């Protein structure tokens, strides 16, 4: 009906309309958005956005740390059965080992069977890149131009084994022993130089093997790019759907054998966490494109008119709403995996395995040992705790973001007429 009988009931609205008419209050609100933007995209420990990115990525890594030791893999480079082919990937979490062996012969790679070596190559590379970056520490979300260097090895023995043949890498026909090739590769739209080198080794009393070294120079470490790597890791597991079987007083794996894509509730959560972090990282560009540091007021030195001097308000609203979205999504990521709200086999998988570390003493993130297998070793519990801590310490900033969203919303309304 009329404004008074309305403000009788909703007195915090009267106060809002008063702030919306006062430049000193509008500018105070804009200073605040400036500051909370910095907490969100310029900080690390105290940013919920950062902790949520880090959690999504660590969940992916942790899932493979738990289950890789038990995953069948093998065959030759053409994706077919091999007779006698042993292919060993270094710095992976295998049974009592820092390497995973793929030497399942005779059976044909594919669904409900052994993972082909082409897939394991895709999986490995993403794993080495993620663990390398986890080790050096993830950058703040605004820093999206950084790079790192990544290096990893794998070997081939057995007669018939085509997995390290030089034509696969563009190295000469000769040149398995000593040959090398340097070649730009394309990763998340950026240009990476990659050197691939081959040597033959002939030990004293045991079989000859080829060793391949991959050196990736200028890999991007931005949140966007590392989320793409996590996505490759978990999608390759889920699409290839290989067979696994576990060596089980202590925690109980459910199911104990079968196909890996059969952890549907776990892979769907992981994929949703990644998706939610991708969309969270995309608010970064909306914040940057609507900076709030220019002060506002009336003009020709007249007093401020909220119905005509407020064309800045659409920007202010977009900036505030984006921040509120980064906060809600960060919280969503954590709730998808927090064991306090899980049941059944899923809860058991998380508290039993994913959120634990059997490595020897807690060594730094990104670290594989002979005792990594069957546990997550990706700081999943500590990351949950720190997400919650950052959120508790964002109490005031969340309230300021809401006030600036309300002020800008009021001004946008006034200015339609």
């Amino acid at each position: 009906e009329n404004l008074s009988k309305l403000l009788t009931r909703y007195s915090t609205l009267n106060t809002l309309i008063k702030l919306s008419a006062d430049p000193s209050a509008i500018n105070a609100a804009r200073e605040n958005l400036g500051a909370s933007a910095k907490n969100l995209i310029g900080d690390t420990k105290n940013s919920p956005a950062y902790q949520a990115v880090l959690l999504a990525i660590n969940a992916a890594v942790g899932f493979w740390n738990v289950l890789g030791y038990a995953t069948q893999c093998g065959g030759n480079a053409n994706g077919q059965e091999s007779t006698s082919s042993t292919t060993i990937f270094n710095n992976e979490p295998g049974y009592r080992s820092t390497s995973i062996t793929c030497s399942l012969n005779r059976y044909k790679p594919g669904y409900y069977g052994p993972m082909s070596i082409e897939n394991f190559k895709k999986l490995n590379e993403a794993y080495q890149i993620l663990q390398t970056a986890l080790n050096k520490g993830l950058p703040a979300l605004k820093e999206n131009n950084g790079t790192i260097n990544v290096e990893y090895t794998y070997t081939c023995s057995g007669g018939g084994n085509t997995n390290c043949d030089p034509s696969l890498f563009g190295i000469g026909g000769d040149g398995r022993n000593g040959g090398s090739v340097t070649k730009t590769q394309t990763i998340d739209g950026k240009q990476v130089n990659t050197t691939i080198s081959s040597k033959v080794v002939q030990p004293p009393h045991s079989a000859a093997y080829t060793e391949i070294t991959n050196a990736l120079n200028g890999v991007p470490d931005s949140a966007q790019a590392l989320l793409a790597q996590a996505s490759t890791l978990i999608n390759t597991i889920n699409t290839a759907c290989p067979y696994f079987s576990v060596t089980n007083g202590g925690p109980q794996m459910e199911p104990t054998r079968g196909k890996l894509c059969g952890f549907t509730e776990e892979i769907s959560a992981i994929q949703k966490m990644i998706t939610d972090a991708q969309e969270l990282v995309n608010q970064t560009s909306v914040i940057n494109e609507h900076e709030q540091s220019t002060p506002v007021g009336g003009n020709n030195g007249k007093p401020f008119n909220p119905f005509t001097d407020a064309s800045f308000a659409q920007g202010m609203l977009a900036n505030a709403s984006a921040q509120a979205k980064m906060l809600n999504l960060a919280h969503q990521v954590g709730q998808t995996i927090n064991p306090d709200n899980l049941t059944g086999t899923f809860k058991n998988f998380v508290t039993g395995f994913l959120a634990t570390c059997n490595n020897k003493s807690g060594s730094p993130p990104g670290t594989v040992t002979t005792q990594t297998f069957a546990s997550g070793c990706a700081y999943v519990e500590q990351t949950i705790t720190n997400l919650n801590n950052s959120i508790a310490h964002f109490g005031t900033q969340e309230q300021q973001i809401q006030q600036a969203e309300n002020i800008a919303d009021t001004l946008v309304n006034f200015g339609s007429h």
Partner: nanobody, 113 residues
Framework: VQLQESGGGLVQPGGSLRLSCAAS????????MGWYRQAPGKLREWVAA???????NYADSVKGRFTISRDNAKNMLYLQMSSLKPEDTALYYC????????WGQGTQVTVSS
């Protein structure tokens, strides 16, 4: 999906109070929870918060006088106020952090000489 505050009333400066909030499990469980107030002529102000594992943190205006706490078995949040001043007068409210869409009725606290 429900928030119910209680325990408030009129007290004397230097006096003391205990507020309770009853929350539904879907809000409470596994979530940071916190307390807020809205004083006359102002917008809602954040007061205190506490993580599921029990770690508290407070706004500068109340630090050293208020204690926040939670009971995870019964879905309850509490706020214990000491050394109260007139400036602490307001409608007190509870929620999770980040905030659920809909607020409860709150509980009135008044401090008057």
């Amino acid at each position: 999906v429900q928030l119910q505050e209680s325990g408030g009333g009129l007290v004397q400066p230097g006096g003391s109070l205990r507020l309770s909030c009853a929350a539904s499990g879907s809000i409470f469980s596994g979530n940071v929870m916190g307390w807020y107030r809205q004083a006359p002529g102002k917008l809602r102000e954040w007061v205190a918060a506490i993580t599921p594992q029990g770690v508290p943190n407070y706004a500068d205006s109340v630090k050293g006088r208020f204690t926040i706490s939670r009971d995870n078995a019964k879905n309850m949040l509490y706020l214990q106020m000491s050394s109260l001043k007139p400036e602490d007068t307001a409608l007190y409210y509870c929620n999770r952090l980040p905030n659920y869409r809909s607020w409860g009725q709150g509980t009135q606290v008044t401090v008057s000489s």
